[PDB]
Design a protein around this ligand. Structure first.
Ligand SMILES: O=C1N2C=C(c3ccc(O)cc3)NC(Cc3ccccc3)C2=N[C@@]1(Cc1ccc(I)cc1)OO
Length: 191
C-alpha cells in the first residue's frame, strides 16, 4: 500500500461529512433513504444526463449497488441516519482493509465505471469540463468555483486532467480517513 490509512470515526467532522451527504441524498426529507433511491439516482444521472450506453449504465449500476450495499443498504429497506452512519463505519473499515492489501476497493470500482462514461477518450482521466458536468448533474457540487478547487487539491498531469488513480487516493482520504491533505476536495460543497 502507498499510504497508511486509518479510520477516525469519533471525529465530528467525519460524522458530519457523511450527515451532509445523508441530507443531500434524502431529497424529500423523510429521515430515511433506500437502496432503490440511490441506484435510481445513479442510473438517472448516467443514462439521462451523461450519455452512457446500456452496458456502461449497467456496469455503473452494479458498482453503486455494491457501494451502498457495503454500507448496509438494501432494496426495500428504509435506512435511517443512525443505521446509515453505523453502516458507513463498516464500509470504511472494509475498504481500508482492502486498500492495505492492494485489493480493489468498491469506490475504485465505482470510479472505473463512472470514468468510462465521463471521459470522452476512455483512458481513465477527466477534464475540468467533464468534472463539472458530472458533479452538477449529480448535484454534489453546484458551483464552477467548487469544481475548480477539486483540481487544486488533486495532483494533475502535464496535460491538465484528473486521473482515476489520483482521484481514488483523494476519495479514500476524504470519505474514509479524514486525511488533512484531502480537505476541500469538493471545495465548499461538502465540508
Ligand atoms: O465519490 C463520489 N461520490 C460519493 C458520494 C457519497 C459519499 C459518502 C456518503 O455518505 C454519501 C455519498 N456520493 C456521490 C454522488 C452520488 C450519490 C448517489 C448516487 C450517485 C451519485 C459521489 N459521486 C462521486 C463519484 C465518484 C466515485 C468514485 C471515484 I475514484 C470518483 C468519483 O464523485 O465525488
Amino acid at each position: 500500500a502507498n499510504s497508511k490509512l486509518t479510520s477516525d470515526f469519533d471525529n465530528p467532522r467525519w460524522i458530519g461529512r457523511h450527515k451532509h451527504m445523508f441530507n443531500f441524498l434524502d431529497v424529500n426529507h423523510n429521515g430515511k433513504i433506500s437502496l432503490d433511491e440511490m441506484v435510481y439516482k445513479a442510473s438517472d444521472i448516467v443514462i439521462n444526463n451523461l450519455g452512457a450506453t446500456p452496458e456502461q449504465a449497467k456496469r455503473h449500476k452494479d458498482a453503486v449497488e455494491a457501494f451502498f450495499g457495503g454500507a448496509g443498504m438494501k432494496y426495500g429497506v428504509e435506512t435511517d441516519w443512525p443505521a446509515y452512519i453505523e453502516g458507513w463505519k463498516k464500509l470504511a473499515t472494509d475498504e481500508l482493509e482492502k486498500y492495505a492489501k492492494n485489493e480493489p476497493t468498491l469506490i475504485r470500482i465505482w470510479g472505473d465505471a463512472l470514468f468510462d462514461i465521463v471521459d470522452k477518450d476512455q483512458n481513465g482521466a477527466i477534464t475540468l469540463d467533464e468534472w463539472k458536468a458530472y458533479t452538477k448533474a449529480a448535484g454534489i457540487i453546484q458551483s464552477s468555483e467548487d469544481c475548480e478547487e477539486t483540481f487544486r487539491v488533486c495532483d494533475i498531469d502535464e496535460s491538465g486532467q484528473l486521473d482515476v488513480d489520483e482521484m481514488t487516493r483523494q476519495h479514500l482520504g476524504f470519505w474514509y480517513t479524514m486525511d488533512p491533505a484531502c480537505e476541500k476536495l469538493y471545495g465548499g460543497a461538502v465540508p
